Write a new protein. Structure first.
Lengths: 115, 231
């Protein structure tokens, strides 16, 4: 296999728990952990975009991005400008914020053509 | 109630002529939704009927630029949600009911081709408020950053004049003055954050001096937005 890793940009309630019970958080020979804590009001938005680039372009093993809406709304331009296939960025709701099916990039594209 | 009914009758009589309504839209545009709000609060059947009739006359096809005026009214004054509520609401005035239904149809037609850009243009025309629609979220602003500037800041020179007027009012402590001082500086900071080329035009036009004066002294919101402008 060529590309298998799962990557999660989510608060501690998601990346640390839930899927982490069966998904893990560390790479076979890396310490990056393919995740970002994203402390509320602590992690920089520029640093958030840097981590998005890290897990989408800088390293190849990541098969999927699983990103919370909190970063996505502030990272809107970066994720909207990303048009590749392999990382398959996937937006998720977090905390109280629901899906909001009129915001995320992929579903925006789908409504753009053909419905 | 009698005074309000008389005022509504006078407004309707004046607005029966399309030219009068079109001219008033350029000076009393906010009054277009103010009358609708007064009717919505007003419980009198006849007064509400008169107010709805006046509103519909303002949107009458005879009135010059009827489509654009109706769209702007629906987008800004919430005339479309108000008409939806009126349709949901019930009244015994058959004439008032018909007038409200016609106003609702006009609002629906106006909103079928509506956009927040009209609200942004109206706010830029006002330039005497504290907050603007684009501050709601990062969605519309994503385009609005290059909307007022016309991709080159050329169309934004009107925004520059609006900010200059808001800064002239900023030296005073009036509630509208402080609101404008905050809003113009916040919009300037939002626009400058992307494509800083136009910032030079703002910088040459006194942008740095305006930011310094906003945070000079005797200001709370003016400095609160000059901090973002200079950051």
């Amino acid at each position: 296999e060529k590309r298998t890793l799962i990557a999660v940009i989510a608060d501690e309630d998601t990346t640390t728990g839930l899927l982490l019970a069966g998904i893990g958080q560390i790479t076979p020979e890396t310490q990056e952990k393919n995740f970002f804590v994203y402390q509320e009001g602590k992690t920089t938005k520029e640093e958030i975009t840097d981590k998005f680039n890290h897990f989408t372009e800088e390293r190849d093993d990541i098969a999927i991005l699983l990103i919370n809406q909190h970063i996505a709304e502030n990272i809107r331009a970066r994720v909207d400008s990303f048009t590749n296939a392999f990382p398959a960025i996937l937006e998720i709701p977090s905390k109280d914020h629901p899906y909001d099916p009129e915001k995320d990039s992929v579903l925006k594209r789908v409504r753009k053509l053909f419905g | 109630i009698q005074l309000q009914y008389h005022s509504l009758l006078l407004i309707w009589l004046l607005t029966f002529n399309p030219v009068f309504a079109n001219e008033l839209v350029q000076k009393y545009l906010s009054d277009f939704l103010d009358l609708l709000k007064l009717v919505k609060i007003t419980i009198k059947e006849k007064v509400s009927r008169l107010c709805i009739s006046i509103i519909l006359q303002c949107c009458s096809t005879r009135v010059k630029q009827h489509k654009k005026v109706i769209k702007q009214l629906l987008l800004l004054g919430n005339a479309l949600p108000t008409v939806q509520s009126l349709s949901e609401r019930k009244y015994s005035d058959e004439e008032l009911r018909q007038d409200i239904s016609n106003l609702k149809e006009i609002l629906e037609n106006e909103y079928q081709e509506l956009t927040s850009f009209d609200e942004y243009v109206a706010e830029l025309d006002s330039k005497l408020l504290c907050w603007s629609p684009p501050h709601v979220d990062n969605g519309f602003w994503s385009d609005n950053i290059d909307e007022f500037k016309k991709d080159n800041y050329k169309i934004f020179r009107q925004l520059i004049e609006l900010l200059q007027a808001k800064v002239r009012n900023g030296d005073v402590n009036a509630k509208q003055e402080k609101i404008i001082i905050q809003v113009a500086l916040n919009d300037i900071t939002h626009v400058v954050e992307l494509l800083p080329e136009s910032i030079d035009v703002l910088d040459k036009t006194g942008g740095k001096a305006d930011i310094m004066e906003l945070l000079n002294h005797s200001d709370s919101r003016v400095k609160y937005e000059a901090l973002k402008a200079t950051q």
